[PDB]
Amino acid sequence: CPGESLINPGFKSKKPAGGVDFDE
Amino acid sequence: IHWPCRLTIGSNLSIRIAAYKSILQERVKKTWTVVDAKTLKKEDIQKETVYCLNDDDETEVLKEDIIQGFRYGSDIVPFSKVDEEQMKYKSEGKCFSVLGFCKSSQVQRRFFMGNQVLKVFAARDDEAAAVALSSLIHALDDLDMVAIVRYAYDKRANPQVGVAFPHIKHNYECLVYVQLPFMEDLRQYMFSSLKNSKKYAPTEAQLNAVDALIDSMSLAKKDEKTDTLEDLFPTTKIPNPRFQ
Amino acid sequence: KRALSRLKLKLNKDIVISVGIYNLVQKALKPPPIKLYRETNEPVKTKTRTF
Amino acid sequence: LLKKHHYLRPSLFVYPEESLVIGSSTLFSALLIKCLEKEVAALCRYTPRRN
Amino acid sequence: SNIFEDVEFCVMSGTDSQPKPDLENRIAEFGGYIVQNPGPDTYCVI
DNA sequence: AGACTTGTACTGGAACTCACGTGAACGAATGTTT
DNA sequence: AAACATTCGTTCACGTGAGTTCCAGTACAAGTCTGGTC
């Protein structure tokens, strides 16, 4: 399934923590 | 007890605030004290803990002879308390900082964490702080926004990321702070859908029956369809049965 | 995935449906420390008693 | 009638099991659909463990 | 031999020529108390 | 006969979670000293 | 009359016992393959 992690199958792949990024 | 601090937006803006704990789970002020069966005195009993090795002879190791270690996969990594204190994450305490402002829709109610709710007021006997906080609250309410903030009770308290949202009432207005989750506390579980399931789809008669059940068991009543609603079973006003 | 508990929701004294309770947000704690022997560096078993 | 500032404990998730009582999934789905339609929440008394 | 006697040695690094366990064995050959971590009774760390 | 493989059931331990206890630390009020 | 020390109720973090779910080890029984002779 798209978005499945390549390290731990069966778990959603967490996007990297980006913190606060102000919008334009 | 009031908690004083400064709400900071950058390094130039600072508003003096006082925080109180509004809602928290309440426990018994006193605890059961274990007393001797016959003498009924607390002085007559004593509790202590002893550590012994896993060898057959069952050696005795004193309290000063133990060092704390952790587990790294299939091994054990010694990590003394002093070394941990040296390497521990150090922070500057008593922070109420505004990381940012975000739309209310983005902060859902099912992600709230923690065991407390804080109410943030302006500092006592300070007109300027009151005006500043009122300005911020009204701006957030008009824009339909909340403030994502960093919170640390003291130097040794782990920093937290939470949401402060406005709360305006006729008598008083205040910010309400509730904790928010880190990345580590989120659980990614997948559940089967119920709308698309073929074998669990209810029929129309079942839906009508459940509609009748919901209608019959309503716990609120409209005031003659005139002004507003009224609650028939207000649970917030029921004392806790445990203490009774 | 693991169910905290499996309970019975009772609409009445006769209508009961089985449900499961899960937690979608759980606080993350450091793994608990384990005591170790300073000399040989092997785990030590702990016990408590009252007298 | 549910207040957002009346937070006391982290929330949980209730999902039908179907392994203990057969026919619970259908009633759970009907309750879900009608509750969403009427914008109501089921008030209940909860006891996780004995005592 | 009985050169070292009732001394706590706590070695946590060894040279490439002398790996940690090898040095542990050599020092233990002379009657030294090996301690995998230092402490109040530790005489010297290596 | 005998030995291994497969299927069913049971029991104990690991892991996870919550409740309860203990320890240390602290702002504000009060008492004491100068 | 003013400054400093002590005490008190509060707060947080960390540790330990009991309940629940899941999986591995164990036991037993049946099935399958084999051996030998008359």
Side-chain angles (χ1 to χ4, degrees):
Chain A
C1 173
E4 208 81 331
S5 99
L6 274 149
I7 309 307
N8 318 275
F11 291 98
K12 290 195 294 188
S13 85
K14 299 176 177 177
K15 300 175 184 174
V20 175
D21 275 341
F22 300 118
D23 295 358
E24 296 185 349
Chain B
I1 47 143
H2 94 302
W3 183 74
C5 214
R6 286 186 341 231
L7 200 164
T8 52
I9 317 178
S11 282
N12 296 166
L13 194 37
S14 158
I15 311 171
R16 295 211 310 121
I17 61 163
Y20 305 92
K21 287 178 76 173
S22 171
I23 286 163
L24 85 177
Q25 223 160 344
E26 281 296 10
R27 26 201 67 201
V28 200
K29 326 193 72 157
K30 304 172 51 43
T31 166
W32 295 104
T33 47
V34 185
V35 304
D36 189 295
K38 269 145 275 298
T39 81
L40 276 40
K41 311 303 300 319
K42 170 263 158 211
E43 313 334 320
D44 199 75
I45 37 74
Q46 202 77 300
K47 210 168 72 174
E48 93 311 358
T49 191
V50 86
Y51 330 89
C52 73
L53 244 177
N54 197 23
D55 260 312
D56 277 20
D57 193 273
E58 297 284 63
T59 325
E60 199 203 11
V61 310
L62 298 321
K63 201 235 181 74
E64 60 247 43
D65 205 327
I66 74 94
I67 89 166
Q68 100 176 308
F70 289 96
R71 189 180 295 283
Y72 198 62
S74 75
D75 325 310
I76 298 176
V77 152
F79 197 175
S80 42
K81 271 195 189 173
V82 64
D83 289 18
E84 179 166 15
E85 274 175 343
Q86 242 284 345
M87 293 170 104
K88 189 149 52 56
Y89 172 83
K90 303 186 209 324
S91 71
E92 325 77 60
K94 274 193 98 84
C95 60
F96 209 75
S97 309
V98 170
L99 304 191
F101 296 106
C102 89
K103 272 172 46 148
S104 201
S105 322
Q106 279 144 359
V107 175
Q108 314 246 40
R109 194 211 191 300
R110 58 212 188 71
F111 288 118
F112 289 179
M113 265 187 45
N115 56 44
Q116 96 194 333
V117 172
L118 274 183
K119 258 180 191 245
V120 179
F121 299 91
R124 186 175 182 169
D125 192 3
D126 201 357
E127 265 77 344
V131 165
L133 211 71
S134 164
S135 296
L136 179 53
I137 290 154
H138 279 307
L140 282 161
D141 196 15
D142 283 2
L143 271 78
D144 188 295
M145 283 210 181
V146 306
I148 302 295
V149 315
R150 167 190 166 106
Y151 172 78
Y153 182 72
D154 67 27
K155 309 149 282 281
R156 87 155 183 120
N158 304 336
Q160 306 171 356
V161 162
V163 66
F165 44 93
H167 198 229
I168 309 203
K169 278 303 209 78
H170 60 282
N171 192 32
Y172 64 83
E173 71 186 330
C174 60
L175 282 176
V176 178
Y177 164 90
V178 191
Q179 185 166 355
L180 277 174
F182 284 122
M183 172 214 77
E184 282 96 340
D185 324 284
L186 301 169
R187 299 283 176 95
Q188 41 268 319
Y189 299 160
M190 290 120 296
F191 300 80
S192 325
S193 147
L194 294 178
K195 221 167 59 156
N196 289 338
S197 209
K198 287 182 177 180
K199 26 172 83 178
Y200 302 150
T203 86
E204 194 169 2
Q206 299 188 356
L207 288 181
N208 298 342
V210 170
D211 188 325
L213 184 86
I214 290 172
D215 258 314
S216 99
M217 294 200 74
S218 155
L219 287 178
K221 202 170 250 60
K222 286 174 72 174
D223 178 33
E224 200 150 37
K225 304 172 178 178
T226 315
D227 38 291
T228 46
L229 241 189
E230 142 159 41
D231 198 334
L232 261 63
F233 186 32
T235 295
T236 278
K237 319 226 210 271
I238 293 167
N240 192 330
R242 162 210 269 275
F243 308 138
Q244 312 280 310
Chain C
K1 188 164 127 177
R2 157 163 137 63
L4 253 74
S5 298
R6 292 199 241 283
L7 303 162
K8 275 177 239 165
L9 181 43
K10 303 161 45 53
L11 279 76
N12 207 357
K13 316 122 194 193
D14 296 342
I15 301 90
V16 185
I17 62 177
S18 70
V19 288
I21 313 298
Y22 308 91
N23 52 4
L24 269 44
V25 289
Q26 183 68 33
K27 181 153 129 226
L29 327 170
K30 326 185 333 185
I34 78 186
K35 324 302 211 63
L36 269 77
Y37 192 22
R38 212 159 58 71
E39 269 73 18
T40 309
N41 204 304
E42 84 280 44
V44 302
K45 302 181 84 184
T46 195
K47 49 194 81 165
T48 318
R49 55 208 202 294
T50 322
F51 38 56
Chain D
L1 267 150
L2 264 62
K3 310 282 174 182
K4 189 152 84 144
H5 56 97
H6 277 5
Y7 168 84
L8 171 53
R9 230 158 160 289
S11 321
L12 295 163
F13 193 59
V14 189
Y15 193 48
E17 205 66 20
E18 187 55 47
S19 157
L20 290 175
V21 179
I22 318 294
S24 51
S25 293
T26 69
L27 182 45
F28 185 96
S29 296
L31 271 164
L32 215 179
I33 292 140
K34 302 316 302 213
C35 284
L36 278 164
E37 201 176 60
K38 290 183 183 347
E39 255 153 0
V40 307
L43 187 75
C44 33
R45 185 136 51 76
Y46 177 65
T47 310
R49 302 158 316 272
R50 205 178 335 283
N51 314 293
Chain E
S1 196
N2 177 22
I3 303 303
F4 283 10
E5 197 198 67
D6 296 298
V7 184
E8 282 96 322
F9 294 92
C10 164
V11 51
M12 328 290 328
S13 266
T15 68
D16 299 349
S17 42
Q18 330 298 342
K20 168 142 82 101
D22 181 67
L23 187 56
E24 303 219 320
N25 196 1
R26 316 219 76 72
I27 184 156
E29 142 159 39
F30 298 114
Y33 206 148
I34 288 284
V35 195
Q36 289 277 336
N37 294 62
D41 202 352
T42 289
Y43 162 89
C44 73
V45 316
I46 293 178

